[PDB]
């Protein structure tokens, strides 16, 4: 429950049945994280 509260894992729990389901989250590529992994190091390699 706190693992869904604090961020970490997202998906649902069937507390009545027992199983914790989790979706298949692929294509993190289009999601705007690796542009930030770029942008951290673009300006820094320009700094060095």
């Amino acid at each position: 429950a706190k693992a869904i509260r604090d961020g970490v894992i997202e998906a649902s729990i069937n507390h009545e049945k027992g199983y914790v389901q989790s979706k298949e989250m692929i294509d993190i590529y289009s999601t705007r994280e690796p542009q930030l992994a770029f942008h951290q190091r673009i300006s820094f390699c320009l700094d060095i």
């Binding site: 429950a1 706190k2 693992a3 869904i4 509260r5 998906a11 649902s12 729990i13 069937n14 507390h15 009545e16 705007r32 542009q35 942008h39 673009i42 300006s43 320009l46």
Partner: protein, 116 residues
């Protein structure tokens, strides 16, 4: 134990004090986890009857479940907690990278040709 999702052990420590009273501290400790269970009712749960999440805190059947059930959603129904697990509105945003990235592209162009 408050750091992780250890709830039940903390509420076992609520009453298992060998040292002294600690009453005013375990009453804050009570409210600050009352709104925490009242927070973690808000997942993508299924229907929970009026027994399970009724007994996850410390109550049998007062109107404290009317206080939480009218405080947040998971509405009072026929032995039902209603799941409004939507999480739908916020995605598909091209314009915000088309403003922020529109800044960062020109900021890439500044330290690219202009002497500093």
């Amino acid at each position: 134990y408050l750091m992780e999702g250890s709830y039940n052990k903390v509420f076992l420590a609520k009453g298992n004090i060998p040292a002294e009273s600690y009453t005013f501290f375990i009453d804050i400790l009570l409210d600050t986890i009352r709104d925490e269970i009242a927070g973690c009712i808000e997942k993508a749960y299924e229907k929970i009857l009026f027994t399970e999440a009724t007994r996850i805190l410390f109550f049998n059947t007062p109107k404290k479940m009317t206080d939480y059930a009218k405080k947040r959603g998971w509405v009072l129904g026929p032995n039902n907690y209603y799941s409004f697990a939507s999480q739908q509105q916020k995605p598909e945003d091209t314009t915000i990278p088309s403003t922020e990235l529109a800044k960062q592209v020109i900021e890439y162009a500044r330290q690219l040709e202009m002497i500093v």
